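Problem: given the chain below (90 residues), write out its structure.
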Amino acid sequence: DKWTVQPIVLPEKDSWTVNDIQKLVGKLNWASQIYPGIKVRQLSKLLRGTKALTEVIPLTEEAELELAENREILKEPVHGVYLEHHHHHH
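Solution.
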């Protein structure tokens, strides 16, 4: 390691509420632009289930499948010494 993105990580439980899914879909979304292979097509659909921010929504086979594969990708560096702008000191 040297310098690049940050350690993008998320919790893991079998009781994701709309509020928990919502925040997630946002993480995977932003992460998507910072991590490929991530999917947020089925994750967002889960919301269509309920609106209450206290409604426990489970992850569908395809939702838990992608989420998993995602949490794994975040293990990549993405960025790291590959820009070189302008600096001279030592």
